[PDB]
Design a protein around this nucleic acid. Sequence first.
DNA 1: GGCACTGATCGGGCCC
DNA 2: TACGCCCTGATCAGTGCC
Length: 343
Amino acid sequence: MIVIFVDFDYFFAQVEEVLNPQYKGKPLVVCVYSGRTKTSGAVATANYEARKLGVKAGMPIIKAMQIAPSAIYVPMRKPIYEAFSNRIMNLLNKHADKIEVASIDEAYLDVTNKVEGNFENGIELARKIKQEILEKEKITVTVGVAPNKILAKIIADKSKPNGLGVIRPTEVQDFLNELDIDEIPGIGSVLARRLNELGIQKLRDILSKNYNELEKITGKAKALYLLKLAQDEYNEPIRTRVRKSIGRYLTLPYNTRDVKVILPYLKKAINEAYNKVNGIPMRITVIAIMEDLDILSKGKKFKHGISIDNAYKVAEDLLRELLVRDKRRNVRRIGVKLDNIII
DNA sequence: GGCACTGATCGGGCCC
DNA sequence: TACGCCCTGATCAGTGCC
Ligand SMILES: [Ca+2]
Ligand SMILES: [Ca+2]
């Protein structure tokens, strides 16, 4: 198998540069503002100029503004980045036997037949793909070329930005012989530090570690994964991916326990959730983030589909029950998720 | 015990 | 210190049932 992983450098920020080229070459920060205050919100992404100054994704806006006061701080415009993504994935689809859009930001392309098994022509094709995306969309990306999904991802993320990582089948075993656990996709930090500390620094340290004592720490799934992965027996095929849930989340104007206050926001969240869902959900979940950013959720799955008018009533009840089991804390953010969807 | 099903938690930008 | 919006599957806990 010959897999080409595609990963769009500093995506949101870079789209903001394509739309406003005055922003290029200077620190730019793409923020999600909640509307509580002028600065309340979070860093979605930043160009590398801003990252040099210490701006990191996930960080509060005000905190980025401490270390990078002169950066350009722009609000996130997800619909546009979505459109950009769509067009780019469409470009990719024409090159692959199969494409797996892992998300708005990245995708895997099985090019095996396309390049007729010739891995080198696979690399060349990857160059053509980078070139084409650059020509048409003015977006730079990083590419991984490898004999599987995971390796392609790993060599990609090790090559950012604007990179072209390659792991020829010749080199695979050597790459696995010297690969840290924290460098594996799907292994946490809570999980990484355990393995790392409690014996298993690198991947090969799994081939010789009584399977069970590993299964204790990771679980059956992850242990099986890491095992076949280390054994060079991971092969997972490229599969078209199907959305399983849609959620909409709102920051309330002010913290409160009063359902009567939260409800119109919860309804609003329900409305554009349903407005965007592609089917009927069998399960509705209410998500409430508390003052201290603790997350409570209460959901209900039905034997049938849930209409929107019904969702209002169900969700109100679920919310009322969340605030029966907490009794003390105020809600800061309200959210709703539609799951188990019938297309 | 073990099936079939519901339900809560979780991590990080996606993955098993 | 500071603090958004959004999405998976695994895993474990509970219930009812044969
Ligand atoms: Ca990515
Ligand atoms: Ca990216």
